Design a protein around this motif. Structure first.
Motif, PDB file in Angstrom:
ATOM      1  N   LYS A  81       0.827  -1.197   0.000  1.00 46.88           N
ATOM      2  CA  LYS A  81       0.000   0.000   0.000  1.00 46.88           C
ATOM      3  C   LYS A  81       0.866   1.253   0.000  1.00 46.88           C
ATOM      4  N   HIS A  82       0.312   2.339  -0.523  1.00 42.84           N
ATOM      5  CA  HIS A  82       1.060   3.581  -0.659  1.00 42.84           C
ATOM      6  C   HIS A  82       1.141   4.288   0.687  1.00 42.84           C
ATOM      7  N   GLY A  83       2.359   4.451   1.199  1.00 38.90           N
ATOM      8  CA  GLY A  83       2.582   5.144   2.448  1.00 38.90           C
ATOM      9  C   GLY A  83       2.456   4.299   3.697  1.00 38.90           C
ATOM     10  N   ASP A  84       2.232   2.994   3.565  1.00 37.91           N
ATOM     11  CA  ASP A  84       2.152   2.091   4.705  1.00 37.91           C
ATOM     12  C   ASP A  84       3.488   1.382   4.864  1.00 37.91           C
ATOM     13  N   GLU A  89       7.053  -3.883   6.169  1.00 40.28           N
ATOM     14  CA  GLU A  89       7.846  -4.743   7.045  1.00 40.28           C
ATOM     15  C   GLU A  89       7.254  -6.144   7.126  1.00 40.28           C
ATOM     16  N   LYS A  90       5.931  -6.234   7.286  1.00 43.07           N
ATOM     17  CA  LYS A  90       5.277  -7.533   7.341  1.00 43.07           C
ATOM     18  C   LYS A  90       5.497  -8.314   6.052  1.00 43.07           C
ATOM     19  N   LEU A  91       5.370  -7.643   4.906  1.00 40.70           N
ATOM     20  CA  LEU A  91       5.555  -8.315   3.625  1.00 40.70           C
ATOM     21  C   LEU A  91       6.990  -8.796   3.463  1.00 40.70           C
ATOM     22  N   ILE A  92       7.964  -7.984   3.886  1.00 43.19           N
ATOM     23  CA  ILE A  92       9.363  -8.392   3.788  1.00 43.19           C
ATOM     24  C   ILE A  92       9.606  -9.645   4.617  1.00 43.19           C
ATOM     25  N   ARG A  93       9.110  -9.653   5.857  1.00 44.52           N
ATOM     26  CA  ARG A  93       9.331 -10.811   6.717  1.00 44.52           C
ATOM     27  C   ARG A  93       8.670 -12.062   6.149  1.00 44.52           C
ATOM     28  N   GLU A  94       7.419 -11.940   5.697  1.00 44.52           N
ATOM     29  CA  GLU A  94       6.722 -13.100   5.152  1.00 44.52           C
ATOM     30  C   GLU A  94       7.400 -13.621   3.893  1.00 44.52           C
ATOM     31  N   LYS A 136      18.281  -3.191   8.273  1.00 45.79           N
ATOM     32  CA  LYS A 136      17.947  -4.275   9.192  1.00 45.79           C
ATOM     33  C   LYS A 136      17.838  -5.617   8.479  1.00 45.79           C
ATOM     34  N   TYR A 137      17.099  -5.680   7.372  1.00 46.56           N
ATOM     35  CA  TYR A 137      16.783  -6.953   6.736  1.00 46.56           C
ATOM     36  C   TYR A 137      17.672  -7.282   5.544  1.00 46.56           C
ATOM     37  N   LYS A 138      18.723  -6.502   5.300  1.00 44.94           N
ATOM     38  CA  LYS A 138      19.704  -6.791   4.256  1.00 44.94           C
ATOM     39  C   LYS A 138      19.102  -6.753   2.855  1.00 44.94           C
TER      40      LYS A 138
END
Lengths: 187, 187
Positions: A81-84, A89-94, A136-138
């Protein structure tokens, strides 16, 4: 007014060298290249360092040339989403947990694509949070400063100047000379 | 009748060397080691070259010492029906596809454990099919010849002699001197 051929065959002159050095000094980076069309730059960029085993996380409001350049390479695409940023972060982790579809192996690479200023909303990109997550997540960061460079900031250096971010944590920057410089091309 | 200490400190004599050479020549392999107890051999073997990221496929009728040796290392275990090879092939394929539990990464190693002759049924192990699957899917083979060595075959060389299999496609062989040689220990 005539050019010889491609830059790799006879096309290079000293003016190209001077322009590349001047752009690199202006932005705050080390080296640069200049192309004869911004759309072509985005279209043919991603094809060089991406394959079908890498992943691209891009905002939902990016430009069309980025979409075509991603489609030509073969990489996977997911959007947020735009601006979220919590969604990002949730999408990166999943997506790190899940891995490649149908096989669940680790993603060979992950790239985040954003835009300095979206020229349909007038809003900016949360660069500090992007750099934080990037550290943080490289992951990697790609910023498209077409409407930002030259026209915004205390002295006109873009969004890095606006947010006081050191222009070293952003892996790749590109833009165009068409919007605020009254010329044609990209870098 | 007395020993000095462990083999690595003062325990070795020339008789140990002669026995190792003779066993290696007899079996059909290159080198060998001899231990003072077969149960201890199986118990402390697997602990050396297996971790929690490797997998062991073992028949459901194996000995207890193999089970304890596998439990001490930490590797994962799956079993197949006794004498069913289609089930073994299916299990190998599914476990290569699935990967490590909870993470689905590739298995760092896969090892197949069988027994030359099961001393509760009197049946033999289908060595040719095991070698075939071993070659095809890049697994490893471990055979336990406690009731087979010395007592079966045209000249008593084990199951490799019985099946005319070259004793080179079997990665590790071990057995005991207790059953048919009237002594104690293992190799």
């Amino acid at each position: 007014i005539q050019s010889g051929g491609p830059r790799a065959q006879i096309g290079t002159t000293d003016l190209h060298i001077k322009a590349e050095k001047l752009v690199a000094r202006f932005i705050g980076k080390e080296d640069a290249l200049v192309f004869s069309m911004g759309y072509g730059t985005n279209a043919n960029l991603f094809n060089a360092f991406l394959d079908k085993k890498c992943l691209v996380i891009s905002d939902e409001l990016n430009h069309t040339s980025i979409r075509t350049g991603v489609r030509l390479s073969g990489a996977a695409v997911r959007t947020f989403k735009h601006g979220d940023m919590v969604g990002l972060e949730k999408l990166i982790r999943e997506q790190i947990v899940l891995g490649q579809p149908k096989t669940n192996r680790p993603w060979k690479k992950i790239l985040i694509c954003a835009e300095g200023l979206f020229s349909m909303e007038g809003t900016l990109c949360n660069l500090p949070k992007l750099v934080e997550l990037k550290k943080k997540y490289k992951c990697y960061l790609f910023i498209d400063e077409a409407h930002s460079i030259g026209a915004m900031g205390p002295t006109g250096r873009g969004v890095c100047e606006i947010f006081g971010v050191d222009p070293k944590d952003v892996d790749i920057l590109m833009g165009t000379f068409t919007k605020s410089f009254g010329a044609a091309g990209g870098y």
